């Protein structure tokens, strides 16, 4: 019923981004979202530079046609500062000062050794091989806006201005526990009726890579006084609770009369596949986001809308829901009108080098283990049906936390 | 001269992933290699369940077309043991065990409530919302081998099989330091020639999101005597040493004397653009990797070179290329003969829901910007020039050391 499309919208226009910050070493930065628009304090390169090795000079003494005794040599760091007298040029290497008055430097190929001292033998142009104070980034200037998720193509660029540390938006907080006395904990043993629970460990993991702070409470007791006092602590630790299983997506049960008494939560009906239930609303100082239970689902789910949920709650500003392309099956799917199917695929270079997609087999929420067969999904327009071998299909590569 | 192939090769053929092994639990596996096969040690589902709401029946009771009674009711985690006498059935819940006779299951919405029981409306097909013990997982087979990368996709799977931590292979520890009386650290100021050091908070950050332990020793001194205080230190405690500029990768002066003092070591230069020239070869207990000054270079450098060796360092069993595709330029491409040029562009889905690249910009290596305007390099072949506007072109997207 819902499109996911509304579903996010709305989440996301009722959020409202954190603000409060910390100051971190750039080490310490990997996947942090800027809090403050990061200002040059220097121009960049911030003097005159050689952009190799080779001969400083004035166009007046190439202008001479005599050839020109090396007065002295100027390194990277250690920059010659003796004197430089008329008809001579000076040997540079790349990053080292120019020298005052320089106008050229020529590489050592448009060079001749004389008995004596250089040749220039080629036209000499004002300004070549000169990289120049502020032609990259003036001081004053905006490098990086707030909002800015920062990796390794922004910090070195933050260390090149002279900066240590920046201002960061704190991490989210996510309180993270599932329900039901038929969920055991690894290495313990399976009473009556139980399973292993893995949706916690699933959505722990993604909070932990997507830089959020967990806070797991674990398996709580299918008891109403155990539970609500599990909302009430999740709800006083963290900017986000997230049921991974066993809280109500719409089921009439206790648990459901506790989220309702605890919060004000909607209960959605998704125009998707795997999946449909979700349940999204606000608690006393925090927002909830309940899963479905089966594996597939909740796990979608998850990645679909509390994980773009989290990225504008953490401050970032980049308008992007991941990378989608139109790419041909190499397999048949079975598909239903009515839903968006974000069924798991398989996504490979044919002989001819161009893009195909396979199945991963059954798509039955049945089984987890077409993520790890996969790595994409095959997202099937609501209305569409089943398709042939050979027809176009929009493709969603999954990202880093699946590979 | 020397190809990237050629040089990749030659590179990963003398190296021996790591074996040595940690166990760790599950939550603390994210991108590390799984050292032994997993190996399910039971049936998932473990017992025959309910996939729906409703109610659990025979085909005899619902063939006689008499409303059932409900004897009990069978929940997730509390299942039903009680007598289920002829001509009754037992409501169900999503996730309970079926009770031992049952046939099939009903959905709530196939059914009426009706005072003397419960009538079934529908159709009942033997097995219906049914899942089996074991259709998921069979007890005794391998559920991930030895070299798996652990994400999001296994640990879960792991987890469902009742196992709490597992033996994965230890990282590798990668040691790093720059030289250059022109460096200086950042947060300090500027004397005269001097720039920040970049490119080794740039090795350091990547280093750490590919999983390595790093051990960074800061700027070393630029003389004779603390650059060998620095490969000793280095050595001593890595598999792998990077400089991450300053130390020779070819041209005559001190570094590169003690280079070949301490090991042996090779001077490619290689048919790349940005950058060329590489510095590859065995210290005493370690490999080394010597990455040219210029940032754009040693980035490229370590991201094409350094990182797949890292990854088969590391146990990991993946192939270990590529994520390319052919695509379409919407930009007109300069590109001179001689060079596998690794530019950067904007891979981005046109009105036609077709992907197509634009270029960043200037490919010039004066600047660094092109790995933040950019989502990916184009791949431009050696002894290709030129390319016009709408020519086919290669390409492989960044992976999340540039955010992809």
């Not at 999946?275 to 796990?299: D, E, H, I, R, Y």
Request: charged share 20%; net charge negative.
């Amino acid at each position: 019923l819902m499109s996911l499309d509304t579903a996010l919208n709305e989440m996301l226009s009722r959020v409202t981004p954190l603000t409060a910050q910390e100051t971190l070493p750039l080490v310490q930065c990997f996947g942090r979202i800027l809090a403050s628009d990061v200002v040059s304090p220097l121009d960049v390169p911030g003097f005159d530079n050689s952009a190799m090795d080779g001969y400083a000079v004035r166009l007046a003494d190439i202008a001479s046609g005599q050839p020109l005794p090396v007065a002295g040599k100027s390194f990277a760091g250690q920059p010659y500062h003796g004197e430089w007298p008329a008809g001579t040029c000076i040997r540079i290497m790349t990053g080292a000062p120019v020298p005052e008055g320089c106008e050229a430097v020529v590489m050592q190929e448009q060079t001749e050794q004389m008995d004596n001292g250089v040749r220039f033998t080629a036209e000499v142009r004002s300004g070549q091989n000169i990289r120049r104070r502020g032609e990259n980034i003036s001081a004053g200037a905006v490098v990086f806006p707030a909002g800015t998720r920062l990796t390794t193509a922004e910090l070195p660029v933050i260390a090149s201005l002279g900066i240590a540390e920046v201002p960061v938006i704190r991490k989210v907080r996510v309180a993270l526990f599932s329900t039901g006395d038929e969920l055991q904990l690894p290495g313990q043993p399976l009473g009556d009726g139980q399973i292993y629970d893995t949706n916690r460990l699933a959505v722990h993991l993604m909070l932990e890579q997507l830089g959020c702070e967990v806070i797991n409470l674990g398996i709580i007791r299918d008891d109403p006084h155990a539970l609500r006092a599990a909302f009430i602590e999740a709800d006083s630790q963290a900017d986000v609770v997230i049921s991974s299983g066993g809280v109500s997506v719409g089921e009439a049960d206790y648990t459901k009369t506790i989220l309702e008494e605890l919060g004000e939560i909607a209960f959605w009906k998704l125009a998707i596949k795997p999946g449909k239930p979700f349940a999204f609303g606000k608690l006393s100082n925090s927002w909830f986001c309940g899963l479905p239970g089966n594996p597939v689902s909740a796990t979608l789910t998850f990645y679909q809308l509390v994980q773009p949920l989290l990225a504008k709650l953490s401050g970032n500003t980049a308008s992007g829901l991941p990378a989608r392309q139109r790419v041909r099956t190499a397999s048949r799917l079975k598909k239903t009108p009515g839903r968006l199917d974000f069924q798991r695929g398989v996504l490979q270079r044919n002989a001819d080098g161009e893009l195909e997609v396979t199945t991963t087999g059954h798509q039955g929420s049945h089984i987890f283990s077409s993520f790890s067969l996969g790595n994409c999904f095959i997202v099937l327009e609501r209305d569409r049906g089943n398709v042939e071998v050979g027809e176009w299909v929009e493709v969603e590569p999954f990202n880093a936390l699946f590979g």
